[PDB]
Design a protein around this ligand. Structure first.
Ligand SMILES: *[C@@H]1O[C@H](CO)[C@@H](O[C@@H]2O[C@H](CO)[C@@H](O[C@@H]3O[C@H](CO[C@H]4O[C@H](CO)[C@@H](O)[C@H](O)[C@@H]4O)[C@@H](O)[C@H](O[C@H]4O[C@H](CO)[C@@H](O)[C@H](O)[C@@H]4O)[C@@H]3O)[C@H](O)[C@H]2NC(C)=O)[C@H](O)[C@H]1NC(C)=O
Ligand SMILES: *[C@@H]1O[C@H](CO)[C@@H](O[C@@H]2O[C@H](CO)[C@@H](O[C@@H]3O[C@H](CO[C@H]4O[C@H](CO)[C@@H](O)[C@H](O)[C@@H]4O)[C@@H](O)[C@H](O[C@H]4O[C@H](CO)[C@@H](O)[C@H](O)[C@@H]4O)[C@@H]3O)[C@H](O)[C@H]2NC(C)=O)[C@H](O)[C@H]1NC(C)=O
Ligand SMILES: *[C@@H]1O[C@H](CO)[C@@H](O[C@@H]2O[C@H](CO)[C@@H](O[C@@H]3O[C@H](CO[C@H]4O[C@H](CO)[C@@H](O)[C@H](O)[C@@H]4O)[C@@H](O)[C@H](O[C@H]4O[C@H](CO)[C@@H](O)[C@H](O)[C@@H]4O)[C@@H]3O)[C@H](O)[C@H]2NC(C)=O)[C@H](O)[C@H]1NC(C)=O
Ligand SMILES: *[C@@H]1O[C@H](CO)[C@@H](O[C@@H]2O[C@H](CO)[C@@H](O)[C@H](O)[C@H]2NC(C)=O)[C@H](O)[C@H]1NC(C)=O
Ligand SMILES: *[C@@H]1O[C@H](CO)[C@@H](O[C@@H]2O[C@H](CO)[C@@H](O)[C@H](O)[C@H]2NC(C)=O)[C@H](O)[C@H]1NC(C)=O
Ligand SMILES: *[C@@H]1O[C@H](CO)[C@@H](O[C@@H]2O[C@H](CO)[C@@H](O)[C@H](O)[C@H]2NC(C)=O)[C@H](O)[C@H]1NC(C)=O
Ligand SMILES: *[C@@H]1O[C@H](CO)[C@@H](O[C@@H]2O[C@H](CO)[C@@H](O)[C@H](O)[C@H]2NC(C)=O)[C@H](O)[C@H]1NC(C)=O
Ligand SMILES: *[C@@H]1O[C@H](CO)[C@@H](O[C@@H]2O[C@H](CO)[C@@H](O)[C@H](O)[C@H]2NC(C)=O)[C@H](O)[C@H]1NC(C)=O
Ligand SMILES: *[C@@H]1O[C@H](CO)[C@@H](O[C@@H]2O[C@H](CO)[C@@H](O)[C@H](O)[C@H]2NC(C)=O)[C@H](O)[C@H]1NC(C)=O
Ligand SMILES: *[C@@H]1O[C@H](CO)[C@@H](O)[C@H](O)[C@H]1NC(C)=O
Ligand SMILES: *[C@@H]1O[C@H](CO)[C@@H](O)[C@H](O)[C@H]1NC(C)=O
Ligand SMILES: *[C@@H]1O[C@H](CO)[C@@H](O)[C@H](O)[C@H]1NC(C)=O
Ligand SMILES: *[C@@H]1O[C@H](CO)[C@@H](O)[C@H](O)[C@H]1NC(C)=O
Ligand SMILES: *[C@@H]1O[C@H](CO)[C@@H](O)[C@H](O)[C@H]1NC(C)=O
Ligand SMILES: *[C@@H]1O[C@H](CO)[C@@H](O)[C@H](O)[C@H]1NC(C)=O
Lengths: 172, 318, 172, 318, 172, 318
């Protein structure tokens, strides 16, 4: 939520998206369509999996310890044992809480950053043939086919072929 | 139309999951996973650990040789399980520093007992009792020797035992506290007893306390239990003139991974690496909220009952 | 300070601002003015209050404990008690320090991010009738009234009505 | 003019506050709040906790029944406050394992004493002393019974007491260490004493140590204080032949939230949930730097004297 | 890696850069060149040094403690001492790990943010005389000298002198 | 050409360094620094701390006055170093609660001994032994006094010592456990001994335990060592009728920064503020993985063997 992409200038999500996490949706002169982008989804999935499998691997193995349940009242030694146990439990619960609280924030912020990165890349591709409409979509001022949007999707859009037509369409 | 449009967006799910963040306390994401294991199966799996079920016997009674714990001779355990239905059915006894001996024998992992030949001249061996019947007749503990006067005298016992091996030896002995001042002189002609057990670096001297006690199984006398550890190169000397419960040998002392646990859960033939007094619990999660007493590779005990970690983006539905 | 909005391309603050935390200040053909924006201020205040009231709620309640002040010198038990107390104090002071150190950084970064979000929204509203002058202000190339700036403030600016005039003013 | 301008910005304050960050150590923000409570009011509020002010008495003297602590009979406390001006004005005594008994009685929360009818036949009861005057005549502790010889003999006392209730019972007894070998045989005809107190699972035997001690309030004899705990279903047996400070009953043992604290601060009628030896401190902040001894819902003791948390943006003035 | 500048739309690094951390490299009508920018490098160095010298200052000084190595087997006290030591070691190793794991991420993200800040400043300077070519470089549509690039480097570029020439060059 | 170009970028290095992050486990940066100090020099520097090398003596033998530790009289230490080649060459002895006395004297930092004039009338002073030769003749500890019968009797010793100074006094005394019942009555005419040492607030009474022990250096008798602490304004009284190892004075008790450490590392003339049983280690890093026993301003012991902190950007080479 630091970049303002998810829950920011993109109003809602797409519940019909089942291929990946991030994707496109175009409205053309031949109809409508929809697709996904594998790279951003893969980056997010790899980062989240790395984090998850980072935290959950084990570190402790204890065999013999002290007594923690007593049937009598004795004195100093029992008091010290109970104090030690209470201190250990209270000091580990705080770590358990803080780790989750920090990692959830970092996960949310990185999954928000990936969307902004994809948006900025798509903006940088359409050099001066498109205008940002403010709600997550680009208005492309020249006429594409279903093969023009796919060149924008797999990163080989050639902007200089449609430059003169777009400039005469948008500025006059 | 001579233009086009290209919109970007992300996915959402109808029901998401509420998680906590640094800023918000309830924020809805598309997916979350649980981090605190808070349930148990109810049984104690016997793999790959070696579990010993102390059905009706404690550790100390199985050490001394109670007649209803004679199946526990040379038991080798990796984790001793003590039940609450345990009881004693022999001579009433008492252990000063009971927890120390219980934790010393629990963490050793063996009840291997090597018998040794002591020479007690001038006394009568193999004393018995009617409170510790082993079969149809009177009996006693199987690892101890109750010496009394031989005819009309009780000489000063003075015995020695060297340690020429390369491991430590654990000796268990005791002292007999009689009930009246008449049964003292009828078993040990001296009007006062004393037991000294000494190594080259320590010594223990105990004196019997004549008096009356509550009736336990038909007796008002008592036995106090002590122990000694002999290291390689040392020597043991026992001096006495009455009220001696002599040993018959030594236990072998080891070091490793072994412990003891009080639990009333049954034992099955599953496979698990963690054991709690409630049963075995899986160890796929880093934290647990079942019991703070654990054996094996167990997760840590926390006070929270649920902690969810987000594994997806935020959920913004239509 | 990660986005470069506060103490970045905005030189100083406005000490005459007493309504909210973020606001506007326009220079028109009829005079000057000033106002505030409630939404960004509200988001920042809600986040900071949530964080604050998150950390300060209580968790401990202790009634009987061990002795921590002695009048004699005794031996092993007193040494172990003093060691336990020293370890507990040293382990809690580190947490006290680290929590504050992390949360101050996060607060500063989020209060910096809100300004950048407001700026980017205002830039996205003025589609091609404005140019960014580099110091936090927009030069609007058509002529507004005191009612044109307020349409930009409450999020209902219609860019296509002034498009031709602005394009002829800025590009020729 | 045919153009316009629209500038954006944030607010600033003339004096801001310096806070620490991950990168910087002193960065100026518009506002900050304090997190460490480092001052105390100076008084101990008596709400909603039940505070008992031990003006001139300790806990053990109020337990035994010192004649200047007779106002503390059946005192029920939630927190006992012990002053430094406390002293003893009765028979000089001694407690082995004093801290254990002090912490056992402090955490119980009651001085409720049920008197029981013991039968001591052959001895004289209600012994007195001139160092423990209760009124104009000689006296003793009010919870103990000093038995001496009756005419010319001192038989072997042997008494029993069963526990048929459903709570634990605490018995306090003692042994008398005389000064010379002449006053031993003039109070107990036997030349050596012995006291045995036994339950079905434990036993304590003590023998008096004749010798001279420093003069304390006019006496060179001493008293040693011991205690026993009887659980429901158990039994208590007392055997002796001299040097016995018998009990008169039992204290009721409870479990809950109670403790003890040494402090010389007065008590007022305010309301606070945390109590330190300096007085009551508020608990609005998570941390505190006043005292590491605390009772109630208290903040944690840290070593830092100030910690400021930022609640605003950065401060960039004109 | 949250802003997508380093290892993002900038393909690789410059191993011939030995003056500073961030710098420029221009291709002119009189040849090529290279230089550095002191301010971004200085900001990054100051932040990283502040962090480093923040963590490494000492806090502990212990003189008398408990025994931690024993030659016998004794019982309860030795068990409690070993438990205390094991708990302390296990609780300090986790902090040692987490501090480094958090600070490395923050360092990487701030050193990535400085590059994006420099890029955005350079973009804001060239108001409408330049176009972003998508790989980290700007195409400047008027003709500069070796003294025109240096005015862009020390922050005194005057865009309005070359505006008409650039607008006629890029749009027609 | 009528245009230009201006590219931006960052630096890279050919070999970078792998560090761990919140997301990745191995990410390559341009530079990193080490945070865990994991090596030692091997020697113990004697600056600016005051190190004392206990070559062949322990602390207790240097306290009592062993004849081969007479160079350690009034040694003032800041850290005592105990070697493993240490042994005893005097009368065989024994200390109940050995660790308590060792830690009490180790943390005091002085062996300063003030001799006092006790008056023992009716006994013979300066007893000797053939197991503790100091020179060519028999000897004993230099801080203790072995009293035996004078001709044909052994009266009841009763001595006093007041404390009028403004510091605490430490008295070290002992009791002699004989071997047979014939050597008891040939040194102390009484058939049973007893030693009482009392202050105004405490008392210790010990009784000798006759018996046989293993032969150590030619003797089967023993000595048990006890200690007493007298606070300003108090008084000490010693009562006995046999088996007393009297003191000759008192040690001065201080409070400060001092300790003890078992190590077999040599001592050099370098400068270091931290000392481990492996030698001195630098303290430029916050963490260390050498030893968990440390003295001075030492880094904390962690379980990890390496932890690298990034001090540069990410490394993306050509
Ligand atoms: C010092 O003081 C103590 C305590 O007062 C005395 O100890 C008691 O000693 C008597 C021995 O005479 C004990 O009596 C016996 O109890 C046995 C167990 O029974 C209890 O439980 C059953 C139910 O299970 C009850 O029905 C029963 O009443 C008891 O409460 C009985 O089985 C015994 O009967 C057997 O033995 C005696 C002698 O062998 C026979 O005469 C009887 O007929 C019967 O066969 C007997 O009743 C009593 O339990 C002890 N009490 C405690 C609390 O320990 C000491 O004797 C005294 N010492 C001196 C020197 O005076
Ligand atoms: C073994 O050794 C110990 C120690 O040496 C002996 O104990 C001392 O015993 C005597 C008893 O004769 C004690 O003496 C008395 O002290 C009382 C308290 O006074 C002290 O404080 C006041 C000021 O408050 C001083 O003025 C005074 O000098 C003391 O220092 C006095 O009040 C006593 O006077 C009273 O009683 C006696 C007898 O009842 C009368 O004759 C006197 O006239 C006077 O009325 C008395 O002086 C002394 O305090 C003990 N010392 C310690 C350190 O305890 C043992 O007696 C000895 N045992 C044997 C068997 O020899
Ligand atoms: C109760 O039981 C104990 C244990 O059985 C008896 O104690 C033993 O007592 C005898 C004394 O007669 C001790 O004997 C002596 O050992 C000395 C040390 O030697 C050991 O080591 C050397 C090598 O260094 C070996 O060669 C040697 O065999 C021993 O194993 C010897 O130096 C002694 O020789 C000297 O003294 C005696 C008497 O002074 C002379 O007659 C000899 O000629 C020689 O000069 C002697 O052999 C023995 O060590 C004790 N054992 C233990 C384990 O302590 C008690 O005596 C017994 N008590 C009663 C009352 O019966
Ligand atoms: C990227 O997408 C474009 C979509 O346009 C692919 O290109 C077309 O490729 C087919 C196959 O030969 C041709 O018949 C069309 O004429 C192409 N159209 C255009 C506009 O180029 C292209 O192959 C894709 N490249 C990759 C690597 O996936
Ligand atoms: C595991 O077993 C323990 C001990 O039997 C359970 O703890 C008790 O829970 C009951 C019910 O909440 C309480 O009344 C007791 O006071 C608890 N005893 C303690 C805390 O010592 C525990 O609930 C069990 N856990 C599971 C998951 O079955
Ligand atoms: C948003 O602000 C605009 C400011 O222009 C408000 O609009 C004007 O509304 C008044 C009231 O009827 C009219 O007389 C003006 O002609 C309007 N001017 C323009 C330029 O539209 C508008 O009402 C505000 N809307 C909200 C929801 O606050
Ligand atoms: C609370 O009371 C404690 C104990 O009286 C105070 O601690 C002492 O402070 C003085 C002055 O700094 C020191 O000389 C003592 O050594 C301290 N005693 C300790 C630490 O046991 C403490 O300062 C008081 N706090 C407040 C806020 O009044
Ligand atoms: C910033 O860089 C510009 C580079 O152009 C410097 O300017 C030139 O200054 C020299 C020195 O007098 C003149 O001869 C040139 O005609 C200037 N050229 C231009 C295009 O202005 C300028 O001095 C630098 N300023 C600072 C503060 O470093
Ligand atoms: C510092 O000294 C300690 C103790 O001598 C060393 O610890 C031992 O290391 C060996 C070899 O790894 C193990 O077999 C022992 O079990 C260790 N003893 C322990 C842990 O008590 C330690 O390795 C030394 N460190 C350095 C850096 O020299
Ligand atoms: C949520 O994540 C878990 C593993 O973390 C996965 O098994 C599950 O399929 C995910 N949920 C959805 C709806 O994909
Ligand atoms: C226990 O093991 C020892 C040594 O192997 C052996 O001597 C002894 O006989 C064994 N016990 C039994 C019950 O046979
Ligand atoms: C600073 O914050 C506190 C509460 O956190 C608030 O009471 C105070 O008014 C704030 N300061 C200003 C100048 O608003
Ligand atoms: C204390 O309480 C008990 C039980 O209620 C009662 O028997 C006893 O008399 C009370 N004490 C006083 C001082 O009356
Ligand atoms: C890496 O950093 C260290 C100090 O942190 C410095 O001494 C070293 O020169 C740096 N490496 C390079 C290549 O500059
Ligand atoms: C030790 O110091 C004390 C007091 O200064 C002194 O009386 C004594 O003689 C010193 N010891 C030696 C060996 O002289």
């Amino acid at each position: 939520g630091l970049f303002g992409a998810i829950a920011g200038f993109i109003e809602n999500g797409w519940e019909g998206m089942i291929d990946g996490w991030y994707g496109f949706r175009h409205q053309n002169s031949e109809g409508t369509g929809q697709a996904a982008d594998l790279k951003s989804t893969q980056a997010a999935i790899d980062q989240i999996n790395g984090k998850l499998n980072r935290v959950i691997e084990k570190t402790n193995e204890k065999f013999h310890q002290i007594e923690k349940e007593f049937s009598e009242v004795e004195g100093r030694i029992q008091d010290l044992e109970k104090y030690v146990e209470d201190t250990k439990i209270d000091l580990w619960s705080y770590n358990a809480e803080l780790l989750v609280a920090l990692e959830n924030q970092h996960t949310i912020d990185l999954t928000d950053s990936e969307m902004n990165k994809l948006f900025e890349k798509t903006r940088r591709q359409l050099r001066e043939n498109a205008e940002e409409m403010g709600n997550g979509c680009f208005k492309i001022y020249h006429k594409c086919d279903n093969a023009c949007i796919e060149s924008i999707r797999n990163g080989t859009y050639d902007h200089d072929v449609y430059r003169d037509e777009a400039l005469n369409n948008r500025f006059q | 139309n001579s233009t086009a449009t290209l919109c970007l967006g992300h996915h959402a799910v109808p029901n998401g999951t509420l998680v906590k963040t640094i800023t918000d306390d309830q924020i809805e994401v598309t997916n979350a996973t649980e981090l605190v294991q808070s349930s148990s199966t109810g049984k104690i799996c016997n793999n790959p650990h070696r579990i010993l079920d102390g059905i009706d016997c404690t550790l100390i009674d199985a050490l001394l040789g109670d007649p209803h714990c004679d199946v526990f001779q040379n038991e080798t355990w990796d984790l001793f399980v003590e039940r609450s239905k345990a009881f004693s059915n022999c001579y009433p006894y008492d252990v000063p520093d009971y927890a120390s001996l219980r934790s010393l024998v629990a963490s050793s992992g063996t009840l291997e007992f090597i018998t040794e030949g002591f020479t007690w001249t001038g006394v009568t061996q193999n004393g018995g009792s009617n409170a510790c019947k082993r079969g149809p007749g009177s009996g006693f503990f199987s690892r101890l020797n109750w010496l009394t006067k031989s005819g009309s005298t009780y000489p000063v016992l003075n015995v020695t035992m060297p340690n020429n091996d390369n491991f430590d030896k654990l000796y268990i002995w005791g002292i007999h506290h009689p009930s009246t001042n008449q049964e003292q002189t009828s078993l040990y002609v001296q009007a006062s007893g004393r037991v000294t057990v000494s190594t080259r670096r320590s010594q223990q001297t105990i004196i019997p306390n004549i008096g009356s006690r509550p009736w336990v199984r038909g007796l008002s006398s008592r036995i106090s239990i002590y122990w000694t550890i002999v290291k390689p190169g040392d020597v043991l000397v026992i001096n006495s003139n009455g009220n001696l419960i002599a040993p018959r040998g030594y236990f072998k002392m080891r070091t490793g991974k072994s412990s003891i646990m009080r639990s009333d859960a049954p034992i099955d033939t599953c496979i698990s690496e963690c054991i709690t007094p409630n049963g075995s619990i899986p160890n796929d999660k880093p934290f647990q909220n079942v019991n703070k007493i654990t054996y094996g590779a167990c997760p840590k005990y926390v006070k929270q009952n649920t902690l969810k970690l987000a594994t997806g983006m935020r959920n913004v539905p239509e």
